[PDB]
């Protein structure tokens, strides 16, 4: 059909979906067609909150099919910087190489 | 009607599940009455393996199911010790507080 | 007819088979050709699991399957080192011989 989710505050819903850790629900949203680059009310991509309190592979999938690890936040904390704020050195290194790919 | 799981190497199933990162399937399992303290071949409960990966969200869901934090794995690492191993402050204080509450 | 499992969790399926300490199944599927070098969530080959189990017979069968005895794990323990920690001196020497050959 192609009719997208057509959701107001789509960034908010995706960000909360990460917040609820709905791994397969997130993958379902991306597979059905939904850009996880849309920033939330604090101008945070769902990738920002995946970097801060989201899963390794869930964050990596958010990168795929539309996302910006280089996207400065409302405070200038891009997803790599968001992972730094979390202190998630695992996600920090993953976002280092992911950001190296993504900045291009 | 009171159904049961009686599932072959249930601990292996849950350790595999958290390995795959399908948080939703693990949610169905635990909410349906899984065994959050089922040690695998390596004497690791689902909390052990989730903490070892560093998946604080999956480990939090397991804790919501009352996963053990006192029993140790095959390498002398209780889920608290594996939580400290992952180095994620969230899961660390979560499992420390779980230990303190489990004391009672 | 060129049968292949094409199953997920190949190494971890091997780990569950070792977990039940059951030899016939392991031998027949390793003959069928599932990779014994695959590592599970614990980043351990099935040979790692058998070595930590001190299962001399199961371990050597996994060696004939081609599982790496030099490969380390999440804790840095090779099957040789896992057997050393387990205390099966016979298995220690067996894995030492194979590991030295494979190291070469």
UniProtKB/Swiss-Prot annotation, chains A, B, C:
ANK repeats, residue ranges: 9-38, 42-71, 75-104
Conditions for induction: Up-regulated under drought, salt stress and cold conditions. Induced by abscisic acid (ABA) treatment in roots and shoots but not in guard cells.
The protein's name: Potassium channel GORK
Organism: Arabidopsis thaliana
Gene (name only): GORK
Annotated compartments: Membrane
Similarity comment: Belongs to the potassium channel family. Plant (TC 1.A.1.4) subfamily.
Function: Major selective outward-rectifying potassium channel of the guard cell membrane. Involved in regulation of stomatal movements according to the water status. Assuming opened or closed conformations in response to the voltage difference across the membrane, the channel is activated by depolarization. Conductance of the channel is modulated in a potassium-dependent fashion. May interact with the cytoskeleton or with regulatory proteins.
Tissue: Expressed in guard cell-containing tissues, in root epidermal cells and in root hairs. Detected in vascular cells of the root and shoot.
Record comment regarding domains: The segment S4 is probably the voltage-sensor and is characterized by a series of positively charged amino acids. The pore-forming region H5 is enclosed by the transmembrane segments S5 and S6 in the Shaker-type (1P/6TM) and contains the GYGD signature motif which seems to be involved in potassium selectivity. The KHA domain (rich in hydrophobic and acidic residues) present in the C-terminal part is likely to be important for tetramerization.
Assembly: The potassium channel is probably composed of a homo- or heterotetrameric complex of pore-forming subunits.
């Amino acid at each position: 059909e192609g009719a997208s989710f057509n959701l107001e505050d789509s960034g908010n819903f995706l960000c909360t979906t990460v917040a609820k850790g709905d791994s397969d629900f997130l993958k379902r949203l991306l597979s059905s067609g939904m850009n996880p680059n849309s920033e939330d009310y604090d101008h945070r991509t769902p990738l920002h909150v995946a970097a801060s309190e989201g899963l390794f592979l869930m964050a990596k999938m958010l990168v795929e099919a539309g996302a910006s690890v280089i996207s400065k936040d409302r405070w200038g904390n891009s997803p790599l910087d968001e992972a730094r704020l979390c202190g998630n050195k695992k996600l920090i290194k993953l976002l280092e190489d992911v950001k190296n790919a993504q900045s291009s």
